[PDB]
Amino acid sequence: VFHTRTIESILEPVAQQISHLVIMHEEGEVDGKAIPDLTAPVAAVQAAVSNLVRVGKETVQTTEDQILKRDMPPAFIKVENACTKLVQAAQMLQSDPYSVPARDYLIDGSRGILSGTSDLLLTFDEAEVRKIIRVCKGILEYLTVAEVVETMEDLVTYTKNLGPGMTKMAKMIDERQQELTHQEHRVMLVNSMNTVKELLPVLISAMKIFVTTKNSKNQGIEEALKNRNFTVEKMSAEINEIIRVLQL
């Protein structure tokens, strides 16, 4: 169900347990079911929620992603308000073990904890993806500069500052595709990255010919320009495809 192996491993068993509890609650089964003392299990949840918000706050302050800074605090409120209902429900159940409003608080609280934790993981994941897209867009912009290269000196400068960006993007895509649960999207990412990687020496070779045809002042210039532009076009189309699949 979840798009990442990490998100799936964290949320799927707790989501299924809550879905089962919600079903029992709406069927009327929870209402008169004897509930043991929940002071300690709820205290363990409040301690875990406090640590998630504290670690979440450390990310908000040290990050530069303004969407993550904006979207994490409403989710902190959500998990904390959910925790409030669980702490209060445990108290209410000690005074009245048959409390129907307290059982409602247990379900709303558990759902709120899940929903808020899910929001936080999805926000954190979207920010990690935005880091990869930034790297992709930087390469796209750098590829728009290939047509400016017209001398040997330009070619050396250009190639030198292209090689690391490509290596960085390939490493990021390789690590990301291994995290995805959707196998068809993993195939799209790796195949697009294979195309970009293999077209890089094709682009460098076309730029070398372009520089040589320009210097010799021969009839082969238009074909050299067309071969370079077509390679920039294909690489750019593939990087735009990677950005699209990364967001899915």
């Binding site: 929870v30 709820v42 875990a48 899940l114």
Partner: peptide
């Protein structure tokens, strides 16, 4: 790292909530 610390914190919330839901659901 900050990523590992955040993920471990979320895992702890899921685990403690799972244990609470299992205790409520208990027949």
């Amino acid at each position: 790292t900050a990523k590992r610390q955040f993920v471990q914190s979320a895992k702890e919330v899921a685990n403690s909530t799972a244990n609470l839901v299992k205790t409520i659901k208990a027949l």
